[PDB]
Write an enzyme that holds these catalytic residues in place. Sequence first.
Site, short mmCIF file in Angstrom:
data_model
loop_
_atom_site.label_atom_id
_atom_site.label_comp_id
_atom_site.label_asym_id
_atom_site.label_seq_id
_atom_site.Cartn_x
_atom_site.Cartn_y
_atom_site.Cartn_z
N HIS A 1 47.95 -7.30 -69.47
CA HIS A 1 46.72 -8.07 -69.57
C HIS A 1 46.63 -9.12 -68.46
O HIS A 1 47.62 -9.47 -67.81
CB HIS A 1 46.60 -8.74 -70.94
CG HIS A 1 46.23 -7.80 -72.04
ND1 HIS A 1 46.42 -8.10 -73.38
CD2 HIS A 1 45.68 -6.56 -72.01
CE1 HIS A 1 46.00 -7.08 -74.11
NE2 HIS A 1 45.55 -6.14 -73.30
N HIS B 1 51.88 -7.15 -79.70
CA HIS B 1 50.61 -7.61 -79.14
C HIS B 1 49.99 -6.53 -78.27
O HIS B 1 48.77 -6.37 -78.23
CB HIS B 1 50.87 -8.89 -78.36
CG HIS B 1 49.76 -9.29 -77.45
ND1 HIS B 1 48.68 -10.04 -77.87
CD2 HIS B 1 49.56 -9.05 -76.13
CE1 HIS B 1 47.87 -10.24 -76.85
NE2 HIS B 1 48.38 -9.65 -75.79
O1 LIG Z 1 45.29 -17.29 -77.00
C1 LIG Z 1 44.60 -16.44 -76.57
C2 LIG Z 1 44.88 -15.89 -75.32
C3 LIG Z 1 44.13 -14.81 -74.87
C4 LIG Z 1 44.76 -13.79 -73.93
P1 LIG Z 1 45.97 -12.69 -74.83
O2 LIG Z 1 45.30 -12.10 -76.05
O3 LIG Z 1 46.41 -11.58 -73.92
O4 LIG Z 1 47.17 -13.50 -75.26
C5 LIG Z 1 42.91 -14.51 -75.52
C6 LIG Z 1 41.97 -13.61 -74.97
F1 LIG Z 1 42.23 -13.00 -73.78
C7 LIG Z 1 40.79 -13.35 -75.65
C8 LIG Z 1 40.53 -13.97 -76.87
F2 LIG Z 1 39.37 -13.71 -77.53
C9 LIG Z 1 41.45 -14.85 -77.41
C10 LIG Z 1 42.65 -15.12 -76.72
O5 LIG Z 1 43.54 -16.00 -77.28
ZN LIG Z 2 47.55 -9.70 -73.92
ZN LIG Z 3 48.34 -14.00 -73.86
#
Ligand SMILES: O=c1cc(CP(=O)(O)O)c2c(F)cc(F)cc2o1
Ligand SMILES: [Zn+2]
Ligand SMILES: [Zn+2]
Length: 230
Positions: A85, A148
Amino acid sequence: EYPTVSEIPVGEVRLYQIADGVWSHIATQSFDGAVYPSNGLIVRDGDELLLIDTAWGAKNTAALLAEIEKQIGLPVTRAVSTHFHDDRVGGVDVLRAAGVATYASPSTRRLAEVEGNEIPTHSLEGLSSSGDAVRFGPVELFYPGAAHSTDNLVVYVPSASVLYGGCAIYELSRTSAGNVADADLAEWPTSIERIQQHYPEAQFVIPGHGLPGGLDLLKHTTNVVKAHTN
Ligand SMILES: O=c1cc(CP(=O)(O)O)c2c(F)cc(F)cc2o1
Ligand SMILES: [Zn+2]
Ligand SMILES: [Zn+2]
Ligand SMILES: [Zn+2]
């Protein structure tokens, strides 16, 4: 004393010394009108540095390199991205332009390419099966299984007892799953248990986002994932 979003503008990076020769880097990114912090890791390897994950974007990652050069003054010779990601590979092109050798598992490289994301150059061998671990410079890389994301890796620094969970591990203040579009919810608690079994001695646990803690961040993440499942 850990930096929060209110103290970092989007575009700037802070470094936080977790232990001797181990730092987290903290940046912020906007998304849908909310601002999120994001963690990565820096590990000293003699007279050079190993970087774990970008700072979520080209501008943040350029600032990360400048802040490392200013505060630490040792060269970043290699970087590992822990899944495909954008908060982990966004900025890989900046790293590569600066002469950093970028690394990811073949799984991560393939998923990044499908996603149209930036693609780390080098392929990490020995991480294809759940429970696999390899030494990489001053750290151990561990593939716990899908969580994840199907490709996510965690990173252990044996000299400092620091476990970096990446986005597979939630901070305590996060009580809902949030974004799990690429997650394997069915396997996530089993993968966390592999981490707990492999690193029972970890003293510091760094989540992908937010405040560090101890090993209870593993059970915390399992609780949140199971509640989201139901
Ligand atoms: O803390 C997070 C971090 C991310 C990136 P990731 O999921 O890769 O950790 C995130 C996202 F990209 C979209 C969202 F809607 C909420 C998120 O909430
Ligand atoms: Zn991610
Ligand atoms: Zn993340
Ligand atoms: Zn909890």
